[PDB]
Amino acid sequence: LAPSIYGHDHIKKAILLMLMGGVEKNLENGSHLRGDINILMVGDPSTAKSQLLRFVLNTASLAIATTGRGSSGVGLTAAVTTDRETGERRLEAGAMVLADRGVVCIDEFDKMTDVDRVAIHEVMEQQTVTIAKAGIHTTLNARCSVIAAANPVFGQYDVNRDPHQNIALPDSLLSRFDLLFVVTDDINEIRDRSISEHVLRTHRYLPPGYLEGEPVRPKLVTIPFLRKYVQYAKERVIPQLTQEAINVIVKNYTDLRNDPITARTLETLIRLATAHAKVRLSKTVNKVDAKVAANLLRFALLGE
Amino acid sequence: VRKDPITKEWTLEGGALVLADKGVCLIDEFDKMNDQDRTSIHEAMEQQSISISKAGIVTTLQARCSIIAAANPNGGRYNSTLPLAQNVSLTEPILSR
Amino acid sequence: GNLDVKKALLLLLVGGVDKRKIRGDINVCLMGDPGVAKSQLLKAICKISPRGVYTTGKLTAAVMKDPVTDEMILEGGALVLADNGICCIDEFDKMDESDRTAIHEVMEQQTISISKAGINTTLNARTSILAAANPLYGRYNPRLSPLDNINLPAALLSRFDILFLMLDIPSRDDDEKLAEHVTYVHMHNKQPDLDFTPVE
Amino acid sequence: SVLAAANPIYGRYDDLKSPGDNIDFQTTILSRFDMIFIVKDDHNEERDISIANHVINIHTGNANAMQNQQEENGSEISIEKMKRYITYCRLKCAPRLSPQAAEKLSSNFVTIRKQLLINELESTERSSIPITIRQLEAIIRITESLAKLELSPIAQERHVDEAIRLFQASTMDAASQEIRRFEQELKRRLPIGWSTSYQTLRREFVDTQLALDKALYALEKHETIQLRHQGQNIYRSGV
Amino acid sequence: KIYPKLHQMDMDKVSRVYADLRRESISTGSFPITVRHLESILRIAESFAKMRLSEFVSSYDLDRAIKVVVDSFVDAQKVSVRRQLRRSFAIYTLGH
Ligand SMILES: Nc1ncnc2c1ncn2[C@@H]1O[C@H](COP(=O)(O)OP(=O)(O)NP(=O)(O)O)[C@@H](O)[C@H]1O
Ligand SMILES: [Mg+2]
């Protein structure tokens, strides 16, 4: 994933598992547990957050791009319009509905007005949006992985202050994301040398057949192969949970919690393990999947 | 810019510095303006134009005004033991104009 | 667990005794952390009651004309649907002042008034209020007051008959049990056996 | 391309105040500018005399003839021809960097990042004007544009030198902006007209320790000290 | 109707006036002398030539313009320095 982005290994791992989200559960009385993995990248400028969103936009089977200022809350859920073919009031699907059984990319997410973010909540919590206006009283499916990019309230992350003080969003919204990643452009000569020489190799690219300086019109898979692998794993394997994985999950969840952690953290660990089982193309979730899921969520929570 | 009531589209309406183009504009009690209102003056007061870009309108109007303004110092009265920038709250970019 | 809360929640449904007025309604607020997931408990007892209704702070009556046709109607809010029943106010700390004053009038007079569009009325609201509220900054600090932790005003909290601050405390004991319960639900697509038989 | 013009907070730059207090813009929006120029009235009298003679030559109408002579002499080109030429460069050429240009740019990035790190330590706060990997791409774009003038299909060492110089002249210059005991110690122990070789002062102060270079910067801005002889000799030149 | 040209310009006088105004304006709170004030001297001289309906700016127009701009600058200063500054600037203006 994103071979032109240096570093960010744990984020690209989380992105891969988010492209391959865990199985959705349906229970008694039609009770529902969501299977999407919702990611928030918050951090310093020039940390490839937007570029990672643009890679996801180019890699998922069904992705809808949005930006904080450019998005209305109505433009996000669904909008009433008159169908001039007949003259009746009809709903027009917004970004969250168009991304159903897909993903939504949100750049500049903390720049949203809060009457927009009030409309995010039902998609995250219930994978649905409800309309109660214009004599139209309906509920629409919005079952999709939100991946979002944001900055702190200050221009860069301030390690002197708490995450709720650094991060603009309410805790009632942050708790709905599966993985909250904090990234920084923290200066270091070795890492700066590495990222720099990588970026220069990236900028020295020339696509085939073009002349030198002409304007445009260690094993790794190709992006078409990767897209096919994701489609295969989404369609053809539904990993079943297994006790040997449960033991790792409960051990890690209790350890993480008994040192920000909350009840929602547990099914996030289950989702990450289930998605990693999909990466193995395996009919069962196993102890390896729980170990990787706990390692990755531990990175996200502790900055490990 | 206004949503035109008979044309149902956006159109411009010239402010005082359009109405007084090739003329004078007279802002009495200049120190009482809200600073967001005051700082609208700048382009018309030096570049002698107004460059609106709103609601899909994008154009530059002529605003060839000599502006004469009247102000009281801070607190209501001058103080000759203070230099100018401490007598009045106006910043250097507007004072220089 | 939380059988003290469950024991109190029942006495909403049966209520006290009214007399010539003296009132039968009983009101309770479930404060504290959102990680306890109190919303599902409100949902449950809302379904138990024969007349109740589930709502969010995100309630007042209004002359809500132009519903489908351009047309006149008076909307009795959820507090009037809950007349002779339970109004389950989820997200109780998030409500706005019009709804706060609506809750004030029903919790005192058991009515909600209108003085709008020429219509001047008092709608009947003999309702019991079940509420759930969550703290500022996400998680409740136990050493600080509820007034420090939660957006609600003290005078309104004083009018509730029971106040339960159900916190979420990490525990090497409880967390294994909750984890095994939840993972059973994920692994078998149904809840585990309860060690007792419930009433439907 | 976004070309933007702004005044600082307090209108005039207010040099003795912190840049984080003078600059309204958040570090997010600032990082999206390849080059940030901080422009100041120098108040130098020779410069002001020169500007006055020039501006008078504008208002007198002398400049109308001067520009025409400059254009016909081939030292200047007109609006029209330059407009067409920018279009032609934007459509013909789009140069790459040579490997040598790439290495020089990479090492320059780590160099300016180190400078920003030590400045943030010396001022004990995150800088308002940032240096980020996006700003390496700023120097890359500037390098390419400089090669794009002459329609050279590759950028070279010379173009990288000019790109680095411009970035140093603009964004770095924007970023660039107990000792009281040590300075009076140096005033006591080095009288007027004599030289202390720097390394001995470093040993003596360390033997009492970064206050040294702040003291030297302050005393060098003042007339009291002069860094003679390749910076080796601390010379008590003034008072 | 009237558009006065600058001519025969006392370039050195306006240059010295602006240079001194800039130097003495380094006082942190003073009226902030800037290049638009230099152009203001020329606008004011042109306006005085306009008052005479004269298509050329005489030395009298320019000298009156310098007197206005210098007095406007001097008048804005605090009493602690205004006498010294007015004495210093007098060479440009009390020659008229
Ligand atoms: N690790 C990296 N490897 C390669 N390029 C990078 C890396 N990090 C940042 N960049 C470059 O930085 C530029 C800006 O990336 P972008 O994704 O817009 O940053 P961002 O995190 O979204 N910053 P912002 O939108 O201001 O919060 C792009 O041209 C990237 O190629
Ligand atoms: Mg971004």
Tab-separated table of C-alpha atoms in Angstrom, chain B residues 22 46-47 78 80-87 92-93 95-97, chain E residues 27-32 34 36-37 43 75-80 82:
chain	number	residue	atom	x	y	z
B	22	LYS	CA	-14.104	60.021	-8.667
B	46	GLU	CA	-4.613	52.577	-1.831
B	47	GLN	CA	-5.126	50.365	-4.903
B	78	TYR	CA	-5.544	63.529	23.098
B	80	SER	CA	0.684	65.140	24.058
B	81	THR	CA	2.988	63.173	26.410
B	82	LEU	CA	2.229	59.998	24.347
B	83	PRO	CA	3.354	59.336	20.742
B	84	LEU	CA	0.705	58.941	18.042
B	85	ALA	CA	0.451	55.134	18.029
B	86	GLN	CA	-0.436	55.279	21.749
B	87	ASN	CA	-2.910	58.148	21.274
B	92	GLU	CA	0.179	51.229	10.879
B	93	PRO	CA	-1.280	49.864	7.572
B	95	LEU	CA	-2.533	55.048	9.381
B	96	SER	CA	-0.026	54.975	6.511
B	97	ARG	CA	-2.889	55.158	3.998
E	27	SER	CA	10.764	56.489	17.089
E	28	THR	CA	8.576	53.485	17.775
E	29	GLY	CA	5.223	55.236	18.307
E	30	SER	CA	5.583	58.026	15.730
E	31	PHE	CA	3.560	58.550	12.542
E	32	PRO	CA	4.832	55.642	10.364
E	34	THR	CA	6.461	54.980	4.382
E	36	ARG	CA	3.252	56.201	0.165
E	37	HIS	CA	4.041	59.384	2.152
E	43	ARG	CA	0.170	64.420	-4.816
E	75	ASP	CA	2.721	68.043	14.961
E	76	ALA	CA	2.092	64.349	15.722
E	77	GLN	CA	5.164	64.070	17.991
E	78	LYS	CA	5.153	64.190	21.792
E	79	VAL	CA	6.282	67.421	23.480
E	80	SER	CA	9.464	65.746	24.788
E	82	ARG	CA	8.795	68.155	19.178
